[PDB]
Design a protein around this ligand. Structure first.
Ligand SMILES: Cc1cc(Oc2ccc(CC(=O)N3CCOC[C@H]3C(=O)O)cc2)ccc1C#N
Length: 188
């Protein structure tokens, strides 16, 4: 078959119920995640191949980067709460992996300030129980699939994308195979 378990995707032994339709996990410390955002735009290209209604969810993980890694999961909850993911994703990636200017929680906050989030707005959100609950959701979702590596994408809590089983001589062909695979899995 053209799409095969073990090839473009794998099937979770214990599938998780009530999971978001398309769920990505990343870390701002994760080198392939940097590529998936800045060079490949995986999330955008997947979204372009799915129906207009479908929901895509993207969550940060704690297991890379120690204390700053957990700060970043909380900051990502702030981003989701305020709806400013698109404004902060690139400068967070570059601050962690390119310019080495993100070394503390205050440095993370600077990125939001420079992106135009008001200081009181960020601090209030950072300390809010709405954001605490979003942190819990990010952790629960990774726990549900015993997540030990990123980037990762899961479809309907049942299938895990396997990019290592796709072709990578051509970056654009790779992205469309990935997106087309997500489409095939969503229609399963
Ligand atoms: C064109 C292109 C294709 C790519 O294909 C992939 C290759 C590998 C991965 C897996 C990954 O990152 N890991 C594996 C399990 O989780 C732990 C983590 C590790 O330990 O490294 C993901 C995608 C990557 C980058 C580019 C570019 N430019």
């Amino acid at each position: 078959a053209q799409y095969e378990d073990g090839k473009q995707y794998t099937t979770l032994e214990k599938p998780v119920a009530g999971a978001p339709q398309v769920l990505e996990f990343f870390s701002f410390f994760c080198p392939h995640c940097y590529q998936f955002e800045e060079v490949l735009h995986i999330s955008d290209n997947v979204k372009k191949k799915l129906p207009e209604g479908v929901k895509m969810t993207k969550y940060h993980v704690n297991f890379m980067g120690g204390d700053l890694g957990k700060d970043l999961t909380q900051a990502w909850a702030v981003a989701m709460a305020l709806g400013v993911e698109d404004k902060v994703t690139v400068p967070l990636f570059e601050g962690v992996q390119k310019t080495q200017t993100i070394r503390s929680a205050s440095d993370i906050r600077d990125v939001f300030i420079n992106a135009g989030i008001k200081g009181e707005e960020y601090d209030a959100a950072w300390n809010s129980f709405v954001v605490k609950s979003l942190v819990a959701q990010q952790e629960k979702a990774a726990a549900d699939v015993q997540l030990r590596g990123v980037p990762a994408m899961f479809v309907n809590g049942k299938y895990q994308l396997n990019p290592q089983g796709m072709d990578t001589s051509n970056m654009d062909v790779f992205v469309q195979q990935y997106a087309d695979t997500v489409k095939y899995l969503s229609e399963k």
